[PDB]
Design a protein around this ligand. Sequence first.
Ligand SMILES: *[C@@H]1O[C@H](CO)[C@@H](O)[C@H](O)[C@H]1NC(C)=O
Ligand SMILES: *[C@@H]1O[C@H](CO)[C@@H](O)[C@H](O)[C@H]1NC(C)=O
Ligand SMILES: *[C@@H]1O[C@H](CO)[C@@H](O)[C@H](O)[C@H]1NC(C)=O
Ligand SMILES: *[C@@H]1O[C@H](CO)[C@@H](O)[C@H](O)[C@H]1NC(C)=O
Lengths: 532, 528
Amino acid sequence: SELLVNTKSGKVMGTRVPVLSSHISAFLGIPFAEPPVGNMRFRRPEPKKPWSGVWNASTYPNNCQQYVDEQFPGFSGSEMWNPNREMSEDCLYLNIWVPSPRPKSTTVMVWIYGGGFYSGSSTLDVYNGKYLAYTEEVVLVSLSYRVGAFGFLALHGSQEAPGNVGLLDQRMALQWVHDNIQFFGGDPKTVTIFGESAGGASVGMHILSPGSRDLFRRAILQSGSPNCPWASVSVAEGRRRAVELGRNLNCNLNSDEELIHCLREKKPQELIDVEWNVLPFDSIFRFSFVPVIDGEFFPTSLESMLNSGNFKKTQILLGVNKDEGSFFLLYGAPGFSKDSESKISREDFMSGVKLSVPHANDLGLDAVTLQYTDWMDDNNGIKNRDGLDDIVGDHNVICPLMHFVNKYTKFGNGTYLYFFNHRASNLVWPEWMGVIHGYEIEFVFGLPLVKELNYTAEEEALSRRIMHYWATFAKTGNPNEPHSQESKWPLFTTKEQKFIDLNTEPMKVHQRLRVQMCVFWNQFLPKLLNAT
Amino acid sequence: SELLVNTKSGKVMGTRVPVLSSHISAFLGIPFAEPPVGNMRFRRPEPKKPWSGVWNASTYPNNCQQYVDEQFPGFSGSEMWNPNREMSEDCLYLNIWVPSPRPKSTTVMVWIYGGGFYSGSSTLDVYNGKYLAYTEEVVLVSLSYRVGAFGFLALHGSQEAPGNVGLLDQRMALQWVHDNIQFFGGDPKTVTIFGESAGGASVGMHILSPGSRDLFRRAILQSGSPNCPWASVSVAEGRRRAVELGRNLNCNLNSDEELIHCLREKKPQELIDVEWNVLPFDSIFRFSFVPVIDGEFFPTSLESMLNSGNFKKTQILLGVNKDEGSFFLLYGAPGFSKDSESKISREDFMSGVKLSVPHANDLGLDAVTLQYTDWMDDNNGIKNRDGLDDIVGDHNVICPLMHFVNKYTKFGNGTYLYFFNHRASNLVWPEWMGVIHGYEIEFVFGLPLVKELNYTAEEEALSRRIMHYWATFAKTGNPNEPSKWPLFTTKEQKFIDLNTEPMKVHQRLRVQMCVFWNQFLPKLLNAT
Ligand SMILES: *[C@@H]1O[C@H](CO)[C@@H](O)[C@H](O)[C@H]1NC(C)=O
Ligand SMILES: *[C@@H]1O[C@H](CO)[C@@H](O)[C@H](O)[C@H]1NC(C)=O
Ligand SMILES: *[C@@H]1O[C@H](CO)[C@@H](O)[C@H](O)[C@H]1NC(C)=O
Ligand SMILES: *[C@@H]1O[C@H](CO)[C@@H](O)[C@H](O)[C@H]1NC(C)=O
């Protein structure tokens, strides 16, 4: 049968799902590892031992234990990111969308959800893969990984909670695709991994990690890179937060054994109710438990690896959105509201920069302030809002990614940079937020194609050309169809540094995405802070 | 006789001079101090001893001993600033232009030449005071002071070479005006001291110094303020440079007394030939012997005086030119030429900022570089040239003056700020230099009023309104006579452009860059 597939770990039964007046096969909730429960919490994942019979893979699996956003109860703008299925530590499953009839050895694209490494699910509506798998004729995989303490608690030295197990969970799902995707009509030699935000950081992390390199062909990074200030911590910082989590729950802090054993006795929600209390400073765009530069998953410092070219050399397609930071200012900085224009006073602007660059000293803070303050009009609420907006987006996403793209391009075999700046017609968030963090995803996933979602005709075209760029890139390493016809997305070179805007208007080629601000964030500020 | 005046020091005989198809009286080279020669070298000035008979005040006096610019021989653009009389240590004299007939108790304006404290003359053509004295009916005086080591060699503690004697020469000339100007129809109670560059800084220094405050009513500072980075040094740096000047001339350095006896045996030119060797860094807009913060002429640090309001409270009228730094890049920065557009490679730009901010560490240099580099086009020679140009102008003149203006206005009784940006139609310097340092001077002195100088009619009108602003201000404390030049307040921070077009009011002159130069860089350097 088309829906019955025999994998290396057991039989699986999918379900025929309708998609845009047609249909396709979907294998949902396929396990790829042993439930990391009990004495398995915090430990490296273990392959799902083979099962007998037929696994019912017709419904979405559970979502990993995570923090749930309740800021705006009922609001679709925020609710669309919360788990839409029951949470559980038993959450290591992957979803697959196969074109019907089943391809022979077609391109495969593996999605890695974002969520600051503290949240995220593979079952969200904006990640429904039937549209992209169907339209571009690709085998689309949806993986999952442990988040928060459950996936990144790190006590370097210990083997019970070594850290980066969330990254290892992803790697095991990738090793699984490598071993069984051929049975679903996918070609394991042509697999592309792509993700947004924390997911984009992950992709760049597999690009770097020797243990992940051979498990994929190419990579796509959306609004995130391995070197983001919020994407990792030192073993020292990791241990401290680990111990502080224990302190927070009254645990025996004498040994990693006692601390860990204590943590494993707590219910999931207990660890989550205190998750945010371990951060070093009051801040925005900083998450408690994230990847650690251990010296194993990451041989050396991310920078030294980027400089020496120690990473997979292949093709990459990456980019960012116009307003990466508004979402985070709305939730954590004073003066911001989703119900107003959020004009910021000079006082709140100041509080906003300290909140945005929590690791900076006074001199650093003055440098940032000066770099984004129009001193002829310092009391302009609008310029203060947008300035603070750019600070958050530049420091946390755009510039770290530009540093990555420039370093990588020195060794890579092809780079394609994009600047997504389209404000969706049916956006439910206030206009001041602009092109919000995560809102290029619904276009990558073809949501604009479904009529009842009420997107405009031009947004459907944008979605269609974006999915095609992604898919064509996945298949060939180039988003452009060889001597096709339409405008050509140019390669990003260390010399020209070209990139295109992604929106509903004709293609526009640009150069040096936000160099001025990024030179500040990538070169000057670091030297300023390093000096004291 | 109108040309014969009895001063408290002795008789003076002036000379009737023609000015724009008319005449006025001119008393040139009147001694106000004892010749600071021989044993008087480096010492505070001594009042001129009364003479008997009639002093011939019909011709300009000597210019003080100074380094002479020879970069462009014959070139009028640089020549107009060189001594135009015999140089001599016997140079403490002042000149006076009195409108004819001799007015009765009228406004007095005292000019103090600039020149980095290492040069300058009161006899230059651009300082001829007949046009301004005539046109605005004011009594115009140009004084003189010792420059270079002769006026600022400072060995604090010593009474033989205490430093700041050049500022004192200035003060003695003012004291002389305060005592004798009434005899020329001047009103000692309505005296305005004005100067450009080093002279503008001097004006600001008299504004701060308790010993100078009662000798004048109001002040005008052009392209200079007391707090300029090149306008002063500490007693330690002053001594260090002094001792180094000795080292350069194989002088006995065992004691100040021996070092000083040695320096006094040398001919003026021997001191000058080594003057520049005492600077601490390779640099531009940095001069060897300048005023020193001694705790005497300057009670405490310039900044503390500005903060505590420890200075004369009155009306001030000051400004800067659009391109203050081009003159200095041309003489000391790589890539610059007088006969070229001077596009600056990226390499020359780098060494250029290094030369402009000699005291900064590497982080400071990166900060300055980042602040002035358009990274979407960093290999643009024009932008690199203009950028380096603004760095030198902003750091040395504009921002230091703006910090001064903002501090003063908190206690002052009236501030009028200007931004002069009119490129002379008949300028001999290349276009890239723009509105050059010192070139608003010819307008203040009304040179555009003389037909054979080939200025345009609009430049003559500009000169006339500038002179009237200066004179009216000098005369009432307001450049406006009852388009209004708005008063500068700490709140509005208004200022006007000074050019051939109609008046345009603006706010916060170069505030973005000056926040960097006045607040961020200093803090960066103090922390690193
Ligand atoms: C798989 O589960 C779905 C959802 O309840 C159900 O409709 C389907 O019949 C199940 N498959 C079998 C035959 O167990
Ligand atoms: C990629 O590598 C191939 C083979 O080494 C080479 O021919 C090609 O020029 C490279 N392309 C890029 C964009 O570096
Ligand atoms: C004053 O000195 C000048 C300069 O030599 C001389 O020409 C003039 O005749 C002198 N005045 C008189 C008449 O004493
Ligand atoms: C100047 O001083 C007078 C007298 O004290 C005062 O009334 C006036 O407001 C002051 N003007 C300015 C510009 O400060």
